[PDB]
Paper text:
In the nucleotide pool, which is more susceptible to oxidation by reactive oxygen species than DNA, human MutT homolog 1 (hMTH1, human [name]) is the most prominent mammalian enzyme among other enzymes responsible for sanitization of the nucleotide pool. hMTH1 is characterized by broad substrate specificity as compared with Escherichia coli MutT; that is, hMTH1 hydrolyzes different oxidized nucleotides such as 8-oxo-dGTP, 2-oxo-[name], and 8-oxo-[name] with almost the same efficiency, whereas MutT shows high substrate specificity for 8-oxoguanine nucleotides. Accordingly, hMTH1 prevents mutations and cell dysfunction by its hydrolytic activity toward both 2-oxo-[name] and 8-oxo-dGTP.
To validate the correlations between the structure and kinetics in the Asp-120 mutants, crystal structures of the Asp-120 mutants (D120N and [name]) in complex with 8-oxo-dGTP or 2-oxo-[name] were determined, respectively. On the other hand, in the structure of [name] complexed with 2-oxo-[name], there is no electron density of 2-oxo-[name], but there are electron densities of water molecules in the substrate-binding site. The loss of the direct interaction between 2-oxoA and Asp-120 explains the lower affinity of [name] for 2-oxo-[name].
Numbering used by the authors: 1 to 156
The structure:
Amino acid sequence: MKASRLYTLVLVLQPQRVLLGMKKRGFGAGRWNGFGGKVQEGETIEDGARRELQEESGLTVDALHKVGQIVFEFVGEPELMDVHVFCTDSIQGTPVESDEMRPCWFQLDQIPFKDMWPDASYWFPLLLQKKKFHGYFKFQGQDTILDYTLREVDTV
Ligand code: NA
């Protein structure tokens, strides 16, 4: 069995639009995603998610709601990514570009799936329907899913 590392992912989902961030530099640049990163020692997962949202988007929020969990496995990487997915309760400031991520609003009939992680085509529709989910995705590289599971759950 494999060890897992904790990550967060935050979707700022409003009634007609969603905020995504384009990764600007390094490997993986060019893909839109929610905001997030590794959880740090001592902080709750929710507090790590709030911290990453502020660092990557500039938005400071008091509370998030957990909507899902996705485990990622990559061929050749023994460590799994255990990603805890949150949506914002409300926001009260403007997003800002950080040298590493460019935030952008998308209308909910223009979700940029072709420029997102392939897994998001599966779980983001559940997120839009205000459902909770558990997913697992095994990737060859960045683009190819070899195996995956997705289930709606009542409790994350
Ligand atoms: Na990040």
